[PDB]
Amino acid sequence: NSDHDRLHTLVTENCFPDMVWDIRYKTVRWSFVESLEPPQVVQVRCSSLMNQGNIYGQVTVRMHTRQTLAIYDRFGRLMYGQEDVPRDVLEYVVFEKHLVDPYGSWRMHGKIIPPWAPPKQPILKTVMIPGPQLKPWEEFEEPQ
Amino acid sequence: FHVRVTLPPRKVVDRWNEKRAMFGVYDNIGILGNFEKHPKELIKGPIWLRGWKGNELQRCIRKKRMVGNRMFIDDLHNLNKRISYLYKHFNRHGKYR
Amino acid sequence: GLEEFFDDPKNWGEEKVKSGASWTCQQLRNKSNEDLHKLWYVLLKERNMLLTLEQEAKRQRLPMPSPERLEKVVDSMDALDKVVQEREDALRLLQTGQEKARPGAWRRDIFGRIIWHKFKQWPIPWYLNKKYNRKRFFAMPYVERFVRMRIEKQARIKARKRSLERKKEKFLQEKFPHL
Amino acid sequence: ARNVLYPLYQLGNPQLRVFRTNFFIQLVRPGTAQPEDTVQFRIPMEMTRVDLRNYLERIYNVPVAAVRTRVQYGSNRRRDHRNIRIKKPDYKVAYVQLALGQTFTFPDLFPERKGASVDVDVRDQVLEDQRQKHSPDPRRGGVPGWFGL
Amino acid sequence: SEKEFVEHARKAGLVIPHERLERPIHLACTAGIFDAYVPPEGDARISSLSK
Amino acid sequence: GADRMSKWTSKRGPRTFCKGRGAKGTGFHGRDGKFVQIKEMIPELVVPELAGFKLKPYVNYRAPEGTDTPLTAKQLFLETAAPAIEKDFKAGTFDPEHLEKYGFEPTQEGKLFQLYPKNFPR
Amino acid sequence: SKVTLPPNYRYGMSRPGSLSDKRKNPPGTRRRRVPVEPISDEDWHLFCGDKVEILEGKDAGKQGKVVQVIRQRNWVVVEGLNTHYRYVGKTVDYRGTMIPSEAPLLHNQVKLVDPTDRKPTDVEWRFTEAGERVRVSTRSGRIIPKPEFPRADGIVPETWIDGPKDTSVEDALEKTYVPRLKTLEEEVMEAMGIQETRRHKKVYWY
Amino acid sequence: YRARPPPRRSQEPRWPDPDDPLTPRWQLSPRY
RNA sequence: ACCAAAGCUAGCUCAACAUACUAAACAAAUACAAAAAUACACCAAAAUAAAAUAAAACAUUCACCUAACAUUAAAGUAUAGGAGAUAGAAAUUUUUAUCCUGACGCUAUAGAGAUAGUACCGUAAGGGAAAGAUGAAAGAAUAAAAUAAAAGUAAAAAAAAGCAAA
Numbered sequence A: 001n002s003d004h005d006r007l008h009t010l011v012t013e014n015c016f017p018d019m020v021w022d023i024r025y026k027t028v029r030w031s032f033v034e035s036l037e038p039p040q041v042v043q044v045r046c047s048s049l050m051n052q053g054n055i056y057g058q059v060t061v062r063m064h065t066r067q068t069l070a071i072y073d074r075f076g077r078l079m080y081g082q083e084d085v086p087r088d089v090l091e092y093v094v095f096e097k098h099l100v101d102p103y104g105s106w107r108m109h110g111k112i113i114p115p116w117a118p119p120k121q122p123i124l125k126t127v128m129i130p131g132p133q134l135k136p137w138e139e140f141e142e143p144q
Numbered sequence B: 001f002h003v004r005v006t007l008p009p010r011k012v013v014d015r016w017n018e019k020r021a022m023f024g025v026y027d028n029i030g031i032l033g034n035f036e037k038h039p040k041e042l043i044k045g046p047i048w049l050r051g052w053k054g055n056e057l058q059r060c061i062r063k064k065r066m067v068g069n070r071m072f073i074d075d076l077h078n079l080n081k082r083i084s085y086l087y088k089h090f091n092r093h094g095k096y097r
Numbered sequence C: 001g002l003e004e005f006f007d008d009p010k011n012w013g014e015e016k017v018k019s020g021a022s023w024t025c026q027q028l029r030n031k032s033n034e035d036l037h038k039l040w041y042v043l044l045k046e047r048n049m050l051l052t053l054e055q056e057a058k059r060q061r062l063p064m065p066s067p068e069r070l071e072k073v074v075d076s077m078d079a080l081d082k083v084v085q086e087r088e089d090a091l092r093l094l095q096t097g098q099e100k101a102r103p104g105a106w107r108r109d110i111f112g113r114i115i116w117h118k119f120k121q122w123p124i125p126w127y128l129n130k131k132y133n134r135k136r137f138f139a140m141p142y143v144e145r146f147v148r149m150r151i152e153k154q155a156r157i158k159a160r161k162r163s164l165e166r167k168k169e170k171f172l173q174e175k176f177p178h179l
Numbered sequence D: 001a002r003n004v005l006y007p008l009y010q011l012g013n014p015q016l017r018v019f020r021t022n023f024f025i026q027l028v029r030p031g032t033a034q035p036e037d038t039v040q041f042r043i044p045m046e047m048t049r050v051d052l053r054n055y056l057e058r059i060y061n062v063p064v065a066a067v068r069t070r071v072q073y074g075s076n077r078r079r080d081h082r083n084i085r086i087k088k089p090d091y092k093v094a095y096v097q098l099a100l101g102q103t104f105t106f107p108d109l110f111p112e113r114k115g116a117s118v119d120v121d122v123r124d125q126v127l128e129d130q131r132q133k134h135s136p137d138p139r140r141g142g143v144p145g146w147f148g149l
Numbered sequence E: 001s002e003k004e005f006v007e008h009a010r011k012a013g014l015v016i017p018h019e020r021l022e023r024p025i026h027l028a029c030t031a032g033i034f035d036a037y038v039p040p041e042g043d044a045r046i047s048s049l050s051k
Numbered sequence F: 001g002a003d004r005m006s007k008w009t010s011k012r013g014p015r016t017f018c019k020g021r022g023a024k025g026t027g028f029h030g031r032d033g034k035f036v037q038i039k040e041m042i043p044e045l046v047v048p049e050l051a052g053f054k055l056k057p058y059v060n061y062r063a064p065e066g067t068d069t070p071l072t073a074k075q076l077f078l079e080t081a082a083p084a085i086e087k088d089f090k091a092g093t094f095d096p097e098h099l100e101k102y103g104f105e106p107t108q109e110g111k112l113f114q115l116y117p118k119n120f121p122r
Numbered sequence G: 001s002k003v004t005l006p007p008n009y010r011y012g013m014s015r016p017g018s019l020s021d022k023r024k025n026p027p028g029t030r031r032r033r034v035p036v037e038p039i040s041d042e043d044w045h046l047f048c049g050d051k052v053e054i055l056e057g058k059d060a061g062k063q064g065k066v067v068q069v070i071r072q073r074n075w076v077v078v079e080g081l082n083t084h085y086r087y088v089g090k091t092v093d094y095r096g097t098m099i100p101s102e103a104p105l106l107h108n109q110v111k112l113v114d115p116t117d118r119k120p121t122d123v124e125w126r127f128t129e130a131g132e133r134v135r136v137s138t139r140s141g142r143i144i145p146k147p148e149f150p151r152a153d154g155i156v157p158e159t160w161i162d163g164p165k166d167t168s169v170e171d172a173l174e175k176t177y178v179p180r181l182k183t184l185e186e187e188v189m190e191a192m193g194i195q196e197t198r199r200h201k202k203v204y205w206y
Numbered sequence H: 001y002r003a004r005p006p007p008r009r010s011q012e013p014r015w016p017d018p019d020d021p022l023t024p025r026w027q028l029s030p031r032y
Numbered sequence I: 001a002c003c004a005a006a007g008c009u010a011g012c013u014c015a016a017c018a019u020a021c022u023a024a025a026c027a028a029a030u031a032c033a034a035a036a037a038u039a040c041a042c043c044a045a046a047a048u049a050a051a052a053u054a055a056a057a058c059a060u061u062c063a064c065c066u067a068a069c070a071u072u073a074a075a076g077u078a079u080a081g082g083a084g085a086u087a088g089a090a091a092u093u094u095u096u097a098u099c100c101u102g103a104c105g106c107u108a109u110a111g112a113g114a115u116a117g118u119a120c121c122g123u124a125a126g127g128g129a130a131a132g133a134u135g136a137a138a139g140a141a142u143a144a145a146a147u148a149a150a151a152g153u154a155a156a157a158a159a160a161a162g163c164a165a166a
């Protein structure tokens, strides 16, 4: 819906730049269909700031999910992925809450991707990666 | 000729404010008041203008006679010049003679 | 004895160099004359050093270490001054009873302004003095006109300052009618 | 002392004494090469040669051999947004020369700490690493990398 | 005959006014994640098994 | 069209124009045309020994300030002349004619530093 | 240092002598005057550090500590309450650190809260019998303390250590004064044992 | 609202300060 | 689509009152070539206002025109005047306090010249400008928001023939 006000109650200051930034001139259609394995709590951590006496509870919830994501380009032409495929995801989702704070919101802090994580589905468009830009007197050198 | 693009703040004048509600109250002070004070007395204004009237020349001439010695230099000088001008104009210029 | 223009070498490259509060007047009223006389030099040396560091900071395009010291020191010296002056001005009020340490007179100059004319020390008395004799303290008659103008001009300014303030009150009263 | 009245001197008067001196002084690094004999100060406009020599010797115990002075004119040329001229204030410069063969040298007041410079290079490397972390993936082609799928 | 342009915009990071801040920046959150749980490498094959 | 606004200074005129920057004259022109300095007109700095004494350019922060009472001619009269005057009136030895024992000075022209015409700079 | 501001000036929460300010309003800026409800300094019931309730905005019915007041524009700052988000670190490839920042409040949108029941209240200045001036609640009929707050220096007097050039409390509070009728010059010259004979010849003043 | 008190002509004898220079010289006369 | 366009403030105007009327600020320096602590002197002063203009010219004359006495009348009367233009009284009369102060005044080509007697122009006396617009916050500039309307241009060169239209 691109509603940022509610998005500032839910997600944290570190997350918001990330999930909003790139996507603001595009259209997103995201749907939740199934949760295959019920959400698991992996771990909990606290950071004790001796300066502020401030504690931030950080809860990592591992979750396995079925989601439909379609990103459209600002001209309305499809960019990322289909709207009909209920694709299976595995995400390790970090949450955070300020404690000493009387208003005590539970928020979505970060998203951790594992080193072995399955390569994300391929892009639609073709992409080109240029070789190093050379000045006149600089000769090219090829690694093997 | 560009005209202002935004509606001004609509100004609300209540006509029942004190000054507007009490307007013209003592104007009949002479008649109903067993004549003692003439309505002139009600007039708040410049000293030379209270309960009196006249064309710009007469006005100026009168201002000078009454307050002319309490005036600032620049203003007295200006007044004299205005008087001289008005004199010359009224007396020697016009269509009708 | 040239190093008193610089901080202890232990301080040189450091960002924050901390320091005490400047002297209040009150703490100084308690000290004797001799000790104030000394404290003046202790404060002097330090003010000099601080100014040196200041300019040298500008030279190196770097921010000055804990700039605030320079303020504090100044105040102290300044404060010290205020104290010593008191004890003189009190004292002479006792002895002579003149409120001003410099002889002076209320005079009216060429331009008709009423001026306070400070006196000057001369080896010869005033009627024998060429240069002083050719000043005029008095106004000629024409000046009287200008004087009037001055007044009127002044009066105007005050007059329309007043009217301004008055106006500002009305505006606010219709903007914030919490009365 | 400055800004103050001095008592008129006539013949056979008491020695004039200043108990709390008004002046102040900057020791400044020279803009041009100078012999090691020579120290250079910026002084107040009203301080004479003799004044400064006495000042140095009495307050600071420095053996002054010789003192010269000049007055530096500050530029009046720079303009305000109003096109009014700004004046960088004029000042007096004092070259002094030390007596006993004493050599001076202007001390370096800002030696850099190598641990703070190494921490600066490491924080610059960490910042460059964060800006390389945030930098878009060439092969994604501009698809936002937040979504798992 | 003498008038010039204005408005050349610039961003200057300078530590001195950044320190002189009278109301230090209040954070709702911390940017990093302290300890990152590193999951089993066979976590795909243990997911099809419930218990 | 010259320069009206900029202040008049020795840097501006001809050779013949020499106007000091406001330092005070230390002497006079003598016989040979050479200049003579009078040792009396040159300010003599009076500097105390600082070494053996304890005071510093700054003060401890937890050290208290105080209620601010500007010294008045009156308070100074009470701390000095009032004890002595009361002591010698209670003893009946008070002499309204000569107050000089209490520190009052009838006239300023005798002493080195005079208060009213103000003989000393600082 | 005292920086003199032009007669017509706007207050942007940025310290008037700072680069944020010189960049916001350069040498020649004269903007439209913002009408400000006049408040005598003796009618001003809001200081820094006291817990207050917000009557307006998206965050309302909440309570927070007052960090900074701006008196010229009649403003309070409740830390991390009235809020809008802003990026701080910036370079061409990197937009860093989105930070919640505080938008100031008029004093009409914030009421002072009395400690006991944590309700908002109408504060009124009262003089008690001890010669003391305290804030008294209209609704609850109690007195409200004043918010003792740290200071701009970040230096707490209780924890402090004297450096080389600091004078100790002892030597500073010590009274050396002997209130006698000589001047500084006579005192010092007598103490240093400087002996002067000659006196000044007559000088004429005019 | 309620109106101001009506303007009335005081019937008491009225004597101007003979010593006030701002007073008109017609109100200082025998005739007055 | 450019160039542009829109704000409502800064302040002002005219009166009232009012105490009384050369503001503010003075540490030093200021009447040497003002802002330069210090040497036998001099110092100071007044003389009718004139003319442009009206008289259809101009010659006597020509209100007001840097001198306190106001107001209602007497009265534009008595008088004075190349008896022309015009000028013009008096005797004698009248005048009740103090509070209710403000605005059918201006809103940036207006209202003060005024953001300033500054810039700039004159050797000097002197003359004398123009200029402002975001928002609660810019300690909200990958920035967010409502005109896109003057002439001038661009988007888009022209095609026999003629006051350009009907």
Ligand SMILES: [Mg+2]
Pocket: D069, D070
């Ligand atoms: Mg030379």
Ligand SMILES: [Mg+2]
Pocket: F001, F002, F004
């Ligand atoms: Mg010129």
Ligand SMILES: [Mg+2]
Pocket: F010, F011, F012, F013, F014, F015, F016, F017, F018
């Ligand atoms: Mg010259």
Ligand SMILES: [Mg+2]
Pocket: F013, F014, F015
């Ligand atoms: Mg030359």
Ligand SMILES: [Mg+2]
Pocket: F035
């Ligand atoms: Mg010589």
Ligand SMILES: [Mg+2]
Pocket: none
């Ligand atoms: Mg004619």
Ligand SMILES: [Mg+2]
Pocket: I056
């Ligand atoms: Mg004609």
Ligand SMILES: [Mg+2]
Pocket: none
């Ligand atoms: Mg003719």
Ligand SMILES: [Mg+2]
Pocket: none
């Ligand atoms: Mg005439």
Ligand SMILES: [Mg+2]
Pocket: none
């Ligand atoms: Mg005749």
Ligand SMILES: [Mg+2]
Pocket: I084
């Ligand atoms: Mg005729």
Ligand SMILES: [Mg+2]
Pocket: none
């Ligand atoms: Mg204008």
Ligand SMILES: [Mg+2]
Pocket: I113
């Ligand atoms: Mg104009």
Ligand SMILES: [Mg+2]
Pocket: none
């Ligand atoms: Mg057009």
Ligand SMILES: [Mg+2]
Pocket: I161
């Ligand atoms: Mg045709």
